[PDB]
Amino acid sequence: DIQMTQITSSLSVSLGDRVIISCRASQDIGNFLNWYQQKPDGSLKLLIYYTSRLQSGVPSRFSGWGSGTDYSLTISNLEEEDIATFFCQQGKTLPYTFGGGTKLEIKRTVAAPSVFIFPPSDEQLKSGTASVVCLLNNFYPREAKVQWKVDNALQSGNSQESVTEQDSKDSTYSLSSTLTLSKADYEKHKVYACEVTHQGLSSPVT
C-alpha cells in the first residue's frame, strides 16, 4: 500500500506513434511492478511484469523500463488494437495496489458540436417531473463546458451528463446534460437555456 500514481488519465495518440505511459510509487518497490491493459470490453490482460518482462504473446512493441520509484511503458509503434486503458500495480507488499489507468484516445481534428435542446413531455410532466435535455452531438475533443441557465439563472447541481466513448468510425464523442426539476419548479420559470462552451468556436451556442 504504496499509493500508485498514474499522472496521465488520457493520452491523445495517433496510430503508429510512440506512446509512453508512466507510473510512480510512493515507496521504493524495487522492480516489483507489473502492467495491464483493459480492453474497451473490460477484459484485462497482463503485458509486462517485474518491470520489464514480457508476458507470452504480448507483442515485443511493448517495453517496460523502471528506476525504483519511477516506471514507464512505451508502446513503440502504436496499433489499432492498443486503444485501451493501462494500469500498473506494485506486487511487493500487501495490499497490492494498482494505479489509476491511462486511457488512450485517437487524435483527430477539432470537431464542433451540433447542439440540440429538447424540452420535457406529456407523460413526465403528468408525473410531475421535468427533465430538460441538451445533446451536444459528434464533437471532438472531449472537453466541452455546458452551463444551464433557467430564466437567465445559473443552475448549480441538477444537471447530470453522459458522454459516449470515442466513436469507432469517425473519432468523435457526444454528450447529454439533463436538468431534472419538478413540475412546480419547471412551471415557475419561462426561459430554459443550454449554454455550450467548446473549442469548436470561440462563441458559445444555446
Binding site: 516489483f32 507489473n34 495491464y36 473490460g42 477484459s43 484485462l44 490482460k45 497482463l46 511484469y49 517485474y50 518482462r53 508476458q55 494500469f87 500495480q89 506486487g91 511487493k92 500487501l94 495490499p95 497490492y96 495496489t97 494498482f98 494505479g99 489509476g100 489507468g101 451540433s114 447542439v115 440540440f116 435542446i117 429538447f118 424540452p119 420535457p120 413531455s121 406529456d122 407523460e123 413526465q124 408525473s127 427533465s131 435535455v133 445533446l135 452531438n137 459528434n138 447530470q160 451528463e161 453522459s162 458522454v163 459516449t164 457526444s174 454528450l175 447529454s176 439533463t178 431534472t180
Partner: protein, 217 residues
C-alpha cells in the same frame, strides 16, 4: 486453453451475503495461488483477497477484512469468495485472477476471468418509464433533425434500446446510464435529416429483462 469463469453476481441488499465462484480450466489449479480483484467503476481496480495453492496462507485487503472469506477446492478446480454484511460500496465487478509463479514473491496476475457483477442497493427491480425526446418540424440544425427516447427510472441495469434496424441515419447514440439518486436514467438519440419527420415514423424499442418491454414514439 487457460480459463476462469466467475459465477454468482447479482443484486443484494445491504447486510446480505453472496458467494462467487471461479472455475479454473487449462492449468493444474493446485499449483497456483489465486486472487480476487475488483473493479468498482467510478473507482478503480482494487485487490481484495489471496489464498495460496492449497489454502495454508491467505491475505485480505483491509476493506473486506472480517467479512469476506476466500477458499478453494482443488479437486473441483474451484475458487470461492463468500461475502457477508455487504455494503453499498462492495458493488463492483469481481475478477478471479491467477498468481503468476515466475519471479519470487512478486504478486502479479497472469490470467483473468471475465467478471461477475455484484450490486448492493436497497432499491428494487423496476422497469423504466420511457418518454419521447422531440425534434421540432424542420428541426434544430436546418437540414437535419434530432429525436430520442429518455428511458428513465429503472433498476438494475441493463435496458437495451433499438429503433431503425437498417441503414442510413442509423446514427443512434445511446448514452451510458447515469445513477440518479437510486435508479438509473439513459437516453438514446438518433440523428436523421429534417426531411424524415412527419413524413415517416421513428419508434425506440426499450427492453429491460428484470421486466418491462416498451416500444414507442
Amino acid at each position: 486453453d487457460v480459463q476462469l469463469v466467475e459465477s454468482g453476481g447479482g443484486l443484494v441488499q445491504p447486510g446480505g451475503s453472496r458467494k462467487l465462484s471461479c472455475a479454473a480450466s487449462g492449468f493444474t489449479f493446485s499449483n497456483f495461488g489465486m486472487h480476487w480483484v475488483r473493479q468498482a467503476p467510478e473507482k478503480g481496480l482494487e485487490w481484495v483477497a489471496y489464498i495460496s495453492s492449497g489454502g495454508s496462507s491467505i491475505n485480505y485487503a483491509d476493506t473486506v477484512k472480517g467479512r469476506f472469506t476466500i477458499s478453494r477446492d482443488n479437486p473441483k478446480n474451484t475458487l470461492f469468495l463468500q461475502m457477508t454484511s455487504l455494503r453499498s460500496e462492495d458493488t463492483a465487478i469481481y475478477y478471479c485472477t491467477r498468481g503468476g509463479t515466475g519471479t519470487r514473491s512478486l504478486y502479479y496476475f497472469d490470467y483473468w476471468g471475465q467478471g461477475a457483477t455484484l450490486i448492493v442497493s436497497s432499491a428494487s427491480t423496476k422497469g423504466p418509464s420511457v418518454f419521447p425526446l422531440a425534434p421540432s418540424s424542420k428541426s434544430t440544425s436546418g437540414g437535419t433533425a434530432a429525436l430520442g427516447c429518455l428511458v428513465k427510472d429503472y433498476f438494475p441495469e441493463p435496458v437495451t434500446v433499438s429503433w431503425n434496424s437498417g441503414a442510413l441515419t442509423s446514427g443512434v447514440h445511446t448514452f451510458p446510464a447515469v445513477l440518479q439518486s437510486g435508479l438509473y436514467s439513459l437516453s438514446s438519440v438518433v440523428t436523421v435529416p429534417s426531411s424524415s419527420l412527419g413524413t415517416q415514423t421513428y419508434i425506440c424499442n426499450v427492453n429491460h429483462k428484470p421486466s418491462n418491454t416498451k416500444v414507442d414514439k
